[PDB]
Structure formats: structure tokens, C-alpha cells
Design a protein around this nucleic acid. Structure first.
Ligand SMILES: [K+]
Ligand SMILES: [K+]
Ligand SMILES: [Mg+2]
Ligand SMILES: [Mg+2]
Ligand SMILES: [Mg+2]
Ligand SMILES: [Mg+2]
Ligand SMILES: [Mg+2]
Ligand SMILES: [Mg+2]
Ligand SMILES: [Mg+2]
Ligand SMILES: [Mg+2]
Ligand SMILES: [Mg+2]
Ligand SMILES: [Mg+2]
Ligand SMILES: [Mg+2]
Ligand SMILES: [Mg+2]
Ligand SMILES: [Mg+2]
Ligand SMILES: [Mg+2]
Ligand SMILES: [Mg+2]
Ligand SMILES: [Mg+2]
Ligand SMILES: [Mg+2]
Ligand SMILES: [Mg+2]
Ligand SMILES: [Mg+2]
Ligand SMILES: [Mg+2]
Ligand SMILES: [Mg+2]
Ligand SMILES: [Mg+2]
Ligand SMILES: [Mg+2]
Ligand SMILES: [Mg+2]
Ligand SMILES: [Mg+2]
Ligand SMILES: [Mg+2]
Ligand SMILES: [Mg+2]
Ligand SMILES: [Mg+2]
Ligand SMILES: [Mg+2]
Ligand SMILES: [Mg+2]
Ligand SMILES: [Mg+2]
Ligand SMILES: [Mg+2]
Ligand SMILES: [Mg+2]
Ligand SMILES: [Mg+2]
Ligand SMILES: [Mg+2]
Ligand code: NA
Ligand code: NA
Ligand code: NA
Ligand code: NA
Ligand code: NA
Ligand SMILES: [Zn+2]
Lengths: 157, 276, 97, 199
RNA sequence: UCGAACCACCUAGUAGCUGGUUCACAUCGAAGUUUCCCUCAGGAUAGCUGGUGCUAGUAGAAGUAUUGUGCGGUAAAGCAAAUGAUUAGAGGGACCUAUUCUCAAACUUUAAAUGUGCAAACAAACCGUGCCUUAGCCAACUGCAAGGCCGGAAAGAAAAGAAUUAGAGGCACCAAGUGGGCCUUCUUCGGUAAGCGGAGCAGGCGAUGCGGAAUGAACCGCUUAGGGAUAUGUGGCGUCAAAACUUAUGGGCUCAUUCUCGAUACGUGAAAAGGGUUGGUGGAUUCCACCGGCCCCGAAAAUGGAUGACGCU
RNA sequence: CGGGUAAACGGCGGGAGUAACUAUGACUCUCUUAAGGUAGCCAAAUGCCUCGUCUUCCAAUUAGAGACGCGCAUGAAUGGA
RNA sequence: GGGCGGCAUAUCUGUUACACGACAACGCAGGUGUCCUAAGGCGAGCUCAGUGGGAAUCUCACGUAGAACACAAGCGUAAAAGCUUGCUUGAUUAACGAUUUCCAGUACGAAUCGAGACUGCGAAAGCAAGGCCAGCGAUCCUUUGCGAAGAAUAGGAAAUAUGAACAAAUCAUACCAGAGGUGUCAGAAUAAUUACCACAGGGAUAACUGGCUUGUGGCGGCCAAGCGUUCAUAGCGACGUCGCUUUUUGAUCCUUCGAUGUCGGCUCUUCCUAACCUAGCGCCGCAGAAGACGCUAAGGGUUGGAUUGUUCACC
RNA sequence: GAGUACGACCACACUUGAGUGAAAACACCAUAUCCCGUCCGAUUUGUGAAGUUAAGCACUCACAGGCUCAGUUAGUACUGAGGUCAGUGAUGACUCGGGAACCCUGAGUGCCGUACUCC
RNA sequence: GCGCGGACAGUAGAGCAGGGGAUCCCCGUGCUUGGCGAGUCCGCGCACCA
């Protein structure tokens, strides 16, 4: 019986086809701050500070930044509760997470609308529901039917 | 049996563009670009030295995701606006270009006249001032793929910048005149190489020879007038660093559209069918 | 496993307080004292009738032992102890080959 | 002797091929997968008949060999040996195990069989129009040698190729077929201009 | 009385084992799983349960969606892509070159469904280049980092299918029984197989009856204070037996002789193969081949017997 | 350490060739032990194969007796005959 | 079932495993208790395995890694993570910092992110507190290392503490960090036999009947290469394939362990048919006689003996 | 319209063949007294400028191979939910939903920054 | 673990494998580290609380 630290990671901790190589310069240049949402994704070409397989593909908040490492808080269910596990990884195994992108865009749009209404400018026209009825004026009208050729065709040989 | 079959190209992963062009060492570049993550992306500068066949390029560079940002540049092909007009790729030229880049960046940052460096070049080593009074501007040295041999001109640009007021962290171990036995530097040898005395000696020998030094011998460049020329060039640099050399048609080819290429192929097929 | 006879290592003490030369001696257990407190208690327990009064281990499984090195600064007389991995054959060699 | 094949008809295992994990496997009993004259050209035999599988089951290599021998012998005695080409399409790659309930019950190799699906082609015979009834009866007997239900059907393509039996003559006349052995590929108008590829 | 007599006593010896364990009804209500143990017929330990409550009662909610953003290599597919296995020809005995017959739990370029992290405005976030503080970063800074303070604005989250809630969140304390499970549905590993053995997900029985499948722990229906009325579910409506007192002003098909044709969801009587009747497809001049339906043959066991019985055409 | 002692406990071998037909093997080479089962006895209350093979006993004998011995695993006061 | 065997007892890859994580079998294929002063650390150069052309190993092109990285496997890696080489000891110390894996969210083992010291390499950015991921160990006991000197009028910021009337020197303890080991690897100090046997229990578990299964045994079909002078089928029937039966044995462990009397024979009754004889009938290679094969048929019948406990056997 | 240096993404950029290239660069190049390193100034290091676009490099071409994005394959394969569904069964269809891959075919063949320089 | 004897006799000789002449003679051959103290392997006889 075998349950190693990296047990069952043959396809998990592997590069995608024709995408091998050391991490990129953008990864080195990304600034990680305490409170940033990050995705924990293991980079198989580093093998230092690599997260345990459980935390691959989890998103959490940064609680700590060290010169070469990142502390992330990750939710982990166990029995009847979810713990807040603080994992330590090298910066190469985190990506700036986009989990709040739609919410930030929504807040930005609301500030912009507030400014426009304060200024008395023209608000954008409202989108309309596509589910409302109306007249349809067809261009081509065809008969939907089963023909002989369909049964003839879908037989092989 | 064939190695370069269809499967070979299907499985092939190209290197980075600058790796297969043989320009960028990406391990070294990644280590040079890296900072403490606790710095939160505070500015960091590489002093880039790239000596071409006829020119020396020295840049102060900042790494950005969109592409590197060049803050200041200096070129050894811009030195004759300061005197020196020959030997633009020797050690004295590398030193002068380094000093020019140092003075240019210190003037552009507004901290010139507050960090002067060594007014007279003595060739001795003084350890830089780093966080590791007011600290001087700090850049790290990027030699690229050049062999870091003792006496190489990349460290000549390094020394020129250091004498110009930079804080480029270095040890004297690769300056010309460093003896690896005693573990010590002969500052006079470095001084002589800085002011070009080796070039003057070789030129004197070549004159006594009676192809080398042809543009030298086309002018009346006596070996004894080299050192003063380099000193005066240093002074002219310290005077005015903004100085430089005094100062639509198209040769692009029309690529033919895909339909035109298809017409060409169809015509060739028609011709070969008729001919046979 | 081959080990150098002289080792260059951080000292620790205010005499040298830096990297320094260390002679290498392999640690070996000192003789069990007759008047060690546990030995006195054991001899008291063992006297009289009743046979053996403590366990005697028999089910030996280890084929090696951990190697402990005594490092001695030339400047001082202080000994530092370091632990190496288990190994069947430890030797202080000078050949460096 | 040999345990009956119906014991190994349930299939339901992950495939268990011969490998460096799976040692001790005897060879399949069928070793000739092409009967008649395989050398014969594609133009020679316009008619193609195949036996189609209607179940998802395992067919032992002994059965494939028996069916092959049956079809060969019938075509020989009721026709000639130079007028048909029959290829056996199913290859026995699944190793069967025997446990010679008990402890350590994992069995050792003792046979090999082909995992076969619904609508899979098991045999294919290439003949001329004149020896079609012999083809059909030979395939009926070979089919009798198989487990499960198989239906014999006429292939609308030309022989073992991928061209319709009717269109083949026109394209061949138009010089649009590369003839290489018992099958032909249609020349596609791509790549360099050769003396081939022109049409 | 003897592979260690008898009598009294230590001795009510110890027992993780077997047997027993005395009133009512009321509110709730399990577990056969985890980790450790000379541990496997037993314990500790967490979980499941009860009793206490504490706290500002709609709060820091969710076995569910949606939208946004991450994770994945199983099903499928592939061998005319790498690694392995593999049949045959063709072009330059073998080698090569283009493919072609077949394919893999310990192969894979690609790649689902179902899933699985995070977010979706009240201790938060946004705005001000607002102030203070710092032995933090930066060559310095009015830049970056961190903690605060002072304010402003907040569809309190528009519109575009643009959620819903029998939607008060948190926090403790003290304890019980369990720690032999078993069945079913999909997925399955070992086995010829098993009412066999082992797992994953989820519902069950165990602990639960009631209605129905004649009968059955587990199937179908429905789950339960004790009573009426009405209406259903599953299942039925020739008698047994409530219901077509054998309904229709519905269409077809089917004949069966000692095994009884059929009326058998689960499931509890079958195949390869073949032939009365009445359907279909494709040809030839009514017959030729082929394919269905129902029926028949293939179809042999021991007390007399079983669509539940009678019987029904 | 060195001697003695079996009517002390006990123990007591194989494979590889050979004689004018076939056999089996007096003979020989070898590997080998502390010694290699001697005199006897036997499918025996001891023989797996086995209901061994031959003779005799009967109409017919997995029984009985007499022989034979490649003796799974007979045998000498663990006393043999 | 137990025993014998094995280790599934501590533990690592791949698969089992069902695209998060988790997931069992005495499931599958393999590993582990070591080994390395370099096989650790760093810098610099270089490119590997294989091909092809050429010189009675050397050369020039190709070469996505098809090599190598101690050891099993997976993953990763090409101006390197491989090879060579230069100088090094970050394989040290590290204020009880935090964390992951196992998980009770305890230790142990292995990891990860750090802060300080002193350093190695490097021009520098940097990189290193072992060789990534398996390679290991509680209490008590034993044993080693650390608490250099020199200072203080007085226990302080800085002097190790104690042996309880107290002072010196021994000696013995103590506080921290390690070593010596428990492989049943959360850690007793352990040989057999019982048919002379005993107890508490167990149908949680074997042996006998019954039940499921039917591999094995038994009995049949289909197809048709052949055998039959000839001729596939009078008779039989390779190689394939589909059944049936519980008259064999195996597999299982559901019932029974506060007990279901256990082989054979004898005696006696009944049932089945896959028919030996007896009744009818087809068919043959059926001249007759004798027979073969099949069909309906289980109403009736189916012996006496030698050896053997036998059932079987065979005379 | 280009070039150089540093670059971001890392083939629409690669590979193989051919063709063209203004200026300035880039590079081939010439050479070893010195710094430095080699068996070998080959590589590397220093010093240089007589020549050349021959190669590198940049652009063009190929019914080129790969690669990228589409379509076709195909509502097919597979699959979440359901039935006292069909079938002896293997399996299959149906009902409410999700929905591929290869083969093949169409198009395309790098792009965005910082500085400096040439038309 | 504690002690002994030995790496043939020793304070470098002896046995003897291979060498010339008639079994004789002659060439050869042979535990570590230190200024007599401290380690490695065989045996013996003795100790056994992680
Ligand atoms: K199986
Ligand atoms: K009612
Ligand atoms: Mg993956
Ligand atoms: Mg008596
Ligand atoms: Mg009592
Ligand atoms: Mg009780
Ligand atoms: Mg309740
Ligand atoms: Mg598949
Ligand atoms: Mg409790
Ligand atoms: Mg119970
Ligand atoms: Mg009922
Ligand atoms: Mg009624
Ligand atoms: Mg009626
Ligand atoms: Mg009924
Ligand atoms: Mg004898
Ligand atoms: Mg005998
Ligand atoms: Mg006898
Ligand atoms: Mg007898
Ligand atoms: Mg006798
Ligand atoms: Mg005797
Ligand atoms: Mg899953
Ligand atoms: Mg998973
Ligand atoms: Mg701590
Ligand atoms: Mg630890
Ligand atoms: Mg580190
Ligand atoms: Mg390391
Ligand atoms: Mg290494
Ligand atoms: Mg490491
Ligand atoms: Mg390790
Ligand atoms: Mg234990
Ligand atoms: Mg007895
Ligand atoms: Mg008893
Ligand atoms: Mg039982
Ligand atoms: Mg019990
Ligand atoms: Mg009873
Ligand atoms: Mg009784
Ligand atoms: Mg009875
Ligand atoms: Na119920
Ligand atoms: Na009717
Ligand atoms: Na440090
Ligand atoms: Na210990
Ligand atoms: Na059988
Ligand atoms: Zn010291």
C-alpha cells in the first residue's frame, strides 16, 4: 500500500502537450499583495514550493507574502466543517485570480452611471427581453420532414 | 530512415523566439528580472551592455510585462561628438560610453551634481553603496551571452558607469589587471587600459612595422596623443551629456492575395495537363 | 560513506565566532557507570529472589546506527556534535577521490 | 481439455492485452488473416461481402480460425482459389484468464479472444459478380462457426476500397486513383505538382 | 470421586464471553464509518443522537440554480499523431517510403456529460492624487506597502429570462447507544459462476407498519395522533374478490394433444437452429429470394399440483 | 583442548559405462560419508505405487499359502532369524 | 475455517479509481530499512541517445531529448535539472516563527514558506541550510555535548542550579540538545505437545444433509472438413458453436455447534426416464438369421455367486 | 518603408527548398603586442577596417510539410434524469436535457511595446 | 560489551608452490597507525535493564 505525498499525480502534475518549459517572465513580474484572490495551480516544472495535490485548482485569499513565497488561505471541507488551511507555496504556483472580475466591472459601471446622472448626460438605452412576442416575417419557409434518403443514408456499407 | 517526418513536426515545440535567434539567455534573464515579492514590484534596473562589431550599446532598462522600458541609452558611435573618433569598440571606448550613460541617467533623474563619482579615473576598486546618506542610483549589470572574462569590455562599461556615479554592485575580479593568484587588483594596469595605453603601444609597433590601424594612419594619430584625447573626452562628457551627433519611400514587396495564388496554381496545373 | 578528516565550519563561540577548522572524531558511548542512579535502582531491584525484573530486548531489527561526529575547534576546546544518516561503513578518509 | 467459450462470453472486463505486465500468453490460434489470393489487384474483384456483428461479445481465436478454414475450403471446392480474397477483420488481443472464490484467485493466461462490438465487420470477401452465391454460402457456413448473431450484407463500395462500386470505374478512367496493392486512395489536389497528382 | 482424592477456607476468585434485568405516555432519535491499540467477539477517538443552554431574532445561511472566473483526462475518439501491440499488399531476403487490417487497466495528440474551487456591496468594496504614523520598499517622492483618522457616494444592487427558500446566524457545556451490517440502482475489480467475494455514488431495510405485486425484510405506491366524508396512488374491474351485473355504437393478431399456448415488471421456465398464419421489402411473370408479428418445434427428473385457483378462445 | 566408550542416544550413499543375439552387469571410472545396511528376512502386524508379478488354493480368490525383491520407509539386545 | 505458505503488519511509484479530493480485495506490475565528501552547494563552458558521409578513435551535417539524473515508477528538465570542469562544506547553526501531508485535524516520518548567525559560489542578479518527492522510532534507562576565561561589595542587562544546620573538594542529580530501539515499525521480555485432555463461547468459522453455482463430471443440439468401395449425414462427426441436468467433484459459507446420529449392507415402499427386456412403429449398408439407429411408451420386469467393509470394479 | 538593442505573447513566428535586398545598421570579415583562453585567436578574449552581401539576417514564392482559427464529421459517439419500457439476453430505442473527437475541407502564415538610428 | 591467543617462527628467518645438475644442495617467497602505545578479521572463555 502506497500513499505518498505525490501519489496519483501522473496526469495532474504534468505539462500540457507542446507547452513544456520553465515558468514565464510575466509570472516573475506579477505583484501579489495580501488580500489578493489567487488560483493555486501547481507548476510541474518547478518542484519547489509546490502545493499538495489537493490544492491544485482552488482559489483563496493571500494572507502572507515572503520574498519568494505566498501564503494562501484555502477552504477545505473535512467531515462536518470546512477549515481555512494556510498553505505555503512559491509564487510560481499562484495566478492572479479573475473570480471577482464581473463584480468589479459591475461596481465600475454603477459608479459611471452615478457620475453621468449627476452630470445630466444621456444614459445608455435599456436592453430589451428577447422573450417578448411579435410579428415574424419569414425569408425562406421549408418543409421539415423525414424522407426515404435519411434511412437509406444512415446505414453503412 | 527519416527523422524529419510529419510526426516530428507535429510533436515539435519551438523555443522562445529570442532563444532560437540566440540572443536571450532566459535563465539568466529570469534571475536578473526577479525581485523579492515583498518589494511589490518596486523599480529595478538592468544595465545592459551589448558590444556589436562596430558599436557599443549601453542601456538602463526596466522589465515590464508589455515589454522592457529603456530609460537612458548611450552608444559608442556617438563618442566623436566628445572628441574620441577612433577605436570606438576598445576598452577606452567602452569606459567612455559607460560614463556617458551614467551621466545621462543621473541628469535625467535630476540627481546629477549630487552624485559625481570619481572625477579622475584611477582604476582602483571602491565597493558600491547599497541598501543590502542618500543612496546612489543602482542598476545591475546584464552582460547577456558574453563571456565574463577578466579584462572584458563589458566590465569596462561597468567601470565607466561606476566612476560616473552609479551604484552597480560588482567586485574588481574581472577588471583588467586583477591577478587571480594574489587575489588583488593592479590599479595602474586598469588605468592604462582605461586611457588606451595598450592601443597606443600597438599603434606604435604597427607604425614601426612599415591593414591594421589604417584609419589611424590616414589621420596623423600619434601614439602619444591618445591618453590626452581620452581625458578630454571624459571632461567633455561631464560638461554636457545631452550632446550627440549633429543632424516617405517604401521598398516593401506586394504579397499576392490567396485568390491570386490559387489562380497561379490552377494555371500551372492547366499548363502541365496540356503539355502532357 | 567517506568523510573528511578536517572540516571547515562555523564555530559558534565568542573565541572564534566564525567559520573555523574542526578535527573529526566519531562519537562512541562511554562506559556505563556502576553508580548511575538508574544502575543503582536496577541493582537494588535485581537482588534477592524473583529472577529477571526488567525486560531484556531481543527483537533487533536495525542493521546500522546513526553516525555522530564530534567536531572540535582548534581555537577552543568546545566539542560540537552532528548527526549523519545511517550507513554500514563510515570512514574518515583523506584521499578525496 | 479446453473450458467452453461460453464461459468467457460475458466479457465485462477492462481489456487485458499481452504486455510486459501480462506474461505467459500463448499465440492466437488464427495467424492467417487474409485468405484466397491477397496479391490480387483492386480492379480484379468488384464485389465485396462482409459479415457484420450484431452483438457486443467476445469471439475466441479458435472460432476465427474455424470460420476461416470453413470459408476457404468451401470456396475451394465450389469455386477456385484464385477468384476470391477474404480478410479476417477481428484480431484477438484480449487475453483470457483461468483460475487453476479461493484466496489469491487472480488467474493466469490460457487463451486469447477478440472484443467485438455491434455493427463491427468480422469478415470481408472480395469476389467477382459470378461467384456471389459461393461467397454467400461460404459466409453462411463460416458464420455458423461464430457465437452470437451475424448478418451478411452486400458492400456497396468497390472491393476493399473506400469508393462506391459504381463510381470506381469512372474515377479510375479519369486517372484519379493511386493504385497501390489491394486498395486505392483518391488523389487529392494538394501538395507539390508531380507527374502524379496532376488530375 | 483420580492426566492430581476428599473436606473447610482464601472465594460472591476473574470472565473483552452466554443467559437474565420488574410501571405508564410525552418530546426527540441513531450506528455498523474514521484514527490508534498483541488490535479483529473488546476498547479509546471523531462522526451520527439527546439534554443543557449562551448570544443583539432574519446576522457570518444553503447536499439547488444562474452569471462570471479557475481546476480535470474518465466516457468517447486515435493508431492516416508519440510510446507499445498488429494483418497485408505497393512502390525504392532484408531494410526503408507512403498506408492499411486491428487495439491498450498500468498509451495518447483531442476531449464530453455528470462534477468540483472562488465571486456575486452593510466589520467588506469604491472615490479623495484628503490628513497622521512607520527602524517597511524604492536613488528619492507628493510614488508603492501597512495601520488608522477625516469626508463623499452608495439602482443596498438598474436593465438584459438576471434566482429561490416551511431562508434567525454564531458559540459552548455534559452525556448515551453504535464502531458484525445487509439490499437495490448506475459504475464496477477478482471469480466459469454463485442467494460469492471487494469498492464508488445515491436511496433503502435494519428501526416500519399501511396499500399493491397470490406469497416474499429490501420491489411498486405511500410512509404512520384517533375518527368521518370526499378524491386518488400503485394495482385492478368473469367468479373467488370491491369494481365494465362479461363496457364500447374500438382496430388488428393468435389454436395450443399428458411439457399443458398465453396472461411471469423486479423474478422466479431458456438458446443456437428451424416451420401454420398474416404483415413488409426488393426482382422476375401468380413465384424468387429476404425481413418482421403471433403460434409451433428445438424443450428430459425424480410425492400430486399450480398464469394464486376455477376457468377463459 | 586431548583420549575412551554404541547390549549410550542413535546412524548405516548416489551416477555412468561395460560380456560373440537381446538383456543384466561379475568388471571399470567417478562424486562422495563418521560409517555407507553385513548375516538374515519380506508386498511381513513394516511396500506408497498395489487388487505388485508367478505358482497354488476355487466354477469364479482385492482373501489365504509358497515363491520373487528396483525394500516409498526390512535388518541385527532401538535385538535379527 | 484453521494449519502450511505468504505479508496484503511500517512504507513508495503506476494501475485498480468511476476527468476535484477520498476510495477495498491474500487485486495487478514493481520498489523500500540502503547508497553518496560527491552522487551535496555554486559558477562557467558544453549537448545527449542515435543516424549519415568520410580517415591502414578522429572528423563534418542531422538529431525535441528517442539519453542522463545511485536505486522501483511517475513527473520534470536542453546555452539544464544532463556531461565536463573550478573551488567549496547551506549535509553547519538556525531565538520553542508559521504551514502541508497522515489526521482525531494528535504525535512520528517526510515536506513547504520564512526570520537571525556564520559561510560557499558568482562580475552580478542570485542560488544553497543535503542528494524534491520512500529510505525510519515514544516513556523509562544508559550515554555524550553545551553552561570558555575575565570581570561585579552583590545577584543586577550580564556569574548554570541542587544535595534542604552549612562550608570546601569530590561523587551524584537537574535543566537544554543529541546518540544507543523497539521491522508486531503509536514501541510486552517468550519453545513445543495433548488421541488423557478441560472451560467460556461461537453456526461471526470448518467437517455431514439441504440452498445458490456448474468450472469439473454427466447428457444433448446446430454447422459440416472428413470416415464410410463410391456417396457429409445407414451408421459418426473433426474444429467450431449453443444448451440441458444436479446421478461427480470443486467453489461458497446461507441454516444448524444449550447436538438434525455419520459409510456400506440388509429390509421395505414409492417416484423419474436420458428404454436393458417386454408391446407397437419407422429406418438401415434391411436377402434371411443376427443386429444398428430412432419414435410412442416407465404398465410389468431387471437374478445366483468368488475376492473386497466397501459404493465402484471384474470374474 | 526599414535597422539595431532590450523585450512581452511564444510556430499564423517552425522546417524544407528556391528568389530579391535602397540607406543606415547587422554580420561575415582582418589580425594577435598587450587583458584573457585554447591541442587548435576554430570557440573565446583583445586591437581593428582592407573587402563582401557569398552566407547569417530581413522580405517574396511553393495547388510544400507543420501550425492557428473555422466549417464538415454530427445532434453522430458518449452522457445527467425516467419507465411495472422492448428484448431470453447481450443490448436497444424512446422521454426531459447536455453534447464530442479523428479523417476531410475553407481561410490564414506572427503580433504588441521601450529607446535609438536610416529613408 | 571484557579479556585473551593468531593474522609458520620472529629481534624479517622457517616451511614450500615454480627454477640446474646427479631423494641431496642452490634461487625465491614472504595484519595496520604512531615514539615500544592506539585500530581491522578469526576464533575461545566470559556481560547482557533503553
Ligand atoms: K471478472
Ligand atoms: K372513499
Ligand atoms: Mg493533466
Ligand atoms: Mg473409585
Ligand atoms: Mg456477582
Ligand atoms: Mg440478553
Ligand atoms: Mg421523530
Ligand atoms: Mg476507450
Ligand atoms: Mg455521544
Ligand atoms: Mg441491530
Ligand atoms: Mg399484498
Ligand atoms: Mg364484485
Ligand atoms: Mg368483455
Ligand atoms: Mg392473479
Ligand atoms: Mg541387504
Ligand atoms: Mg518387501
Ligand atoms: Mg499384510
Ligand atoms: Mg495374498
Ligand atoms: Mg506371502
Ligand atoms: Mg549393534
Ligand atoms: Mg470523480
Ligand atoms: Mg478524483
Ligand atoms: Mg513552534
Ligand atoms: Mg518532523
Ligand atoms: Mg532555499
Ligand atoms: Mg539541497
Ligand atoms: Mg544531484
Ligand atoms: Mg531541496
Ligand atoms: Mg529522500
Ligand atoms: Mg504492534
Ligand atoms: Mg494412542
Ligand atoms: Mg464443554
Ligand atoms: Mg453462517
Ligand atoms: Mg456471537
Ligand atoms: Mg437443536
Ligand atoms: Mg436428537
Ligand atoms: Mg431425528
Ligand atoms: Na412504506
Ligand atoms: Na377487439
Ligand atoms: Na538566510
Ligand atoms: Na534512542
Ligand atoms: Na462438460
Ligand atoms: Zn572556535
Amino acid at each position: 500500500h502506497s500513499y505518498g505525498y505525490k501519489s496519483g499525480t501522473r496526469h495532474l502534475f504534468a505539462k500540457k502537450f507542446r507547452k513544456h518549459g520553465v515558468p514565464s517572465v510575466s509570472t516573475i513580474l506579477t505583484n501579489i499583495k495580501v488580500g489578493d484572490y489567487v488560483d493555486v495551480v501547481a507548476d510541474s516544472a518547478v518542484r519547489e514550493g509546490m502545493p499538495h495535490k489537493y490544492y491544485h485548482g482552488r482559489t483563496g485569499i493571500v494572507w502572507n507574502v515572503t520574498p519568494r513565497g505566498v501564503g494562501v488561505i484555502i477552504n477545505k471541507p473535512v467531515r462536518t466543517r470546512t477549515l481555512r488551511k494556510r498553505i505555503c507555496v512559491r509564487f510560481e504556483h499562484v495566478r492572479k485570480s479573475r473570480c471577482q472580475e464581473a463584480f468589479k466591472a459591475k461596481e465600475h459601471q454603477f459608479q459611471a452611471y452615478l457620475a453621468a446622472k449627476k452630470a445630466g448626460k444621456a444614459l445608455p438605452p435599456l436592453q430589451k427581453s428577447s422573450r417578448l412576442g411579435g410579428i415574424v416575417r419569414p425569408k425562406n419557409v421549408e418543409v421539415l420532414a423525414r424522407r426515404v434518403a435519411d434511412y437509406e443514408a444512415m446505414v453503412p456499407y | 530512415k527519416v527523422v524529419k517526418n510529419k510526426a516530428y513536426f507535429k510533436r515539435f515545440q519551438v523555443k522562445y523566439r529570442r532563444r532560437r535567434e540566440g540572443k536571450t539567455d532566459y535563465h539568466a534573464r529570469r534571475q536578473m528580472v526577479l525581485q523579492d515579492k515583498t518589494k511589490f514590484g518596486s523599480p529595478k534596473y538592468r544595465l545592459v551592455v551589448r558590444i556589436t562589431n562596430k558599436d557599443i550599446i549601453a542601456q538602463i532598462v526596466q522589465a515590464k510585462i508589455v515589454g522592457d522600458e529603456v530609460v537612458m541609452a548611450a552608444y559608442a558611435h556617438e563618442l566623436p561628438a566628445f572628441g574620441i573618433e577612433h577605436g570606438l569598440t576598445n576598452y577606452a571606448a567602452a569606459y567612455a560610453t559607460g560614463l556617458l550613460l551614467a551621466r545621462r541617467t543621473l541628469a535625467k533623474l535630476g540627481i546629477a551634481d549630487k552624485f559625481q563619482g570619481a572625477k579622475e579615473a584611477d582604476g582602483s576598486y571602491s565597493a558600491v553603496r547599497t541598501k543590502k546618506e542618500r543612496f546612489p542610483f543602482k542598476a545591475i549589470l546584464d552582460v547577456g551571452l558574453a563571456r565574463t572574462t577578466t579584462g572584458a569590455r563589458v566590465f569596462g562599461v561597468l567601470k565607466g558607469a561606476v566612476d560616473g556615479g552609479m551604484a552597480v554592485p560588482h567586485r574588481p575580479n574581472r577588471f583588467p589587471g586583477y591577478n587571480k593568484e594574489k587575489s588583488s587588483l593592479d590599479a595602474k594596469v586598469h588605468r592604462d587600459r582605461i586611457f588606451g595605453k595598450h592601443v597606443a603601444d600597438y599603434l606604435k609597433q604597427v607604425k614601426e612595422e612599415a591593414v591594421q590601424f589604417s584609419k589611424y594612419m590616414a589621420a596623423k594619430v600619434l601614439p602619444e596623443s591618445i591618453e590626452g584625447m581620452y581625458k578630454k573626452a571624459h571632461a567633455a562628457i561631464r560638461a554636457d551629456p545631452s550632446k550627440s551627433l549633429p543632424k516617405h519611400k517604401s521598398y516593401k514587396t506586394k504579397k499576392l492575395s490567396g485568390a491570386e495564388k490559387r489562380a497561379a496554381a490552377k494555371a500551372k496545373v492547366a499548363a502541365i495537363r496540356e503539355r502532357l | 560513506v567517506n568523510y573528511p578528516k578536517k572540516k571547515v565550519m562555523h564555530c559558534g563561540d565568542a573565541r572564534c565566532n566564525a567559520h573555523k577548522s574542526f578535527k573529526v572524531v566519531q562519537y562512541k558511548a562511554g562506559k556505563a557507570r556502576l553508580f548511575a542512579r538508574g544502575k543503582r535502582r536496577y541493582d537494588r531491584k535485581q537482588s534477592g529472589y524473583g529472577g529477571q525484573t526488567k525486560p531484556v530486548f531481543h527483537k533487533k531489527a536495525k542493521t546500522t546506527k546513526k553516525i555522530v561526529l564530534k567536531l572540535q575547534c582548534s581555537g577552543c576546546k568546545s566539542i560540537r556534535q552532528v548527526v549523519l544518516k545511517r550507513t554500514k561503513h563510515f570512514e574518515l578518509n583523506d584521499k578525496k577521490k | 481439455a479446453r473450458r467452453p467459450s461460453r464461459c468467457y462470453r460475458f466479457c465485462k472486463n477492462k481489456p487485458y492485452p499481452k504486455s510486459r505486465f501480462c506474461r505467459g500468453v500463448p499465440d492466437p490460434k488464427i495467424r492467417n488473416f487474409d485468405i484466397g489470393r491477397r496479391r490480387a489487384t483492386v480492379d480484379e474483384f468488384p464485389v465485396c461481402i462482409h459479415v457484420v456483428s450484431r452483438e457486443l461479445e467476445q469471439i475466441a481465436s479458435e472460432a476465427l480460425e474455424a470460420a476461416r478454414i470453413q470459408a476457404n475450403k468451401y470456396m475451394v471446392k465450389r469455386a477456385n482459389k484464385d477468384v476470391f480474397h477474404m480478410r479476417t477483420r477481428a484480431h484477438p488481443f484480449h487475453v483470457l484468464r483461468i483460475n487453476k472464490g479461493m484466496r489469491g484467485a487472480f488467474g493466469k493466461p490460457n487463451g486469447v479472444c477478440a472484443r467485438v462490438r455491434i455493427g463491427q465487420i468480422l469478415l470481408s470477401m472480395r469476389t467477382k459478380e459470378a461467384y456471389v452465391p459461393q461467397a454467400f454460402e461460404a459466409l453462411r457456413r463460416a458464420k455458423m462457426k461464430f457465437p452470437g448473431r451475424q448478418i451478411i450484407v452486400m458492400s456497396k463500395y468497390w472491393g476493399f476500397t473506400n469508393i462506391l462500386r459504381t463510381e470506381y470505374e469512372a474515377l479510375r478512367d479519369a486517372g484519379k486513383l493511386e493504385q497501390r496493392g489491394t486498395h486505392c486512395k483518391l488523389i487529392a489536389p494538394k501538395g507539390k505538382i508531380t507527374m502524379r497528382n496532376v488530375m
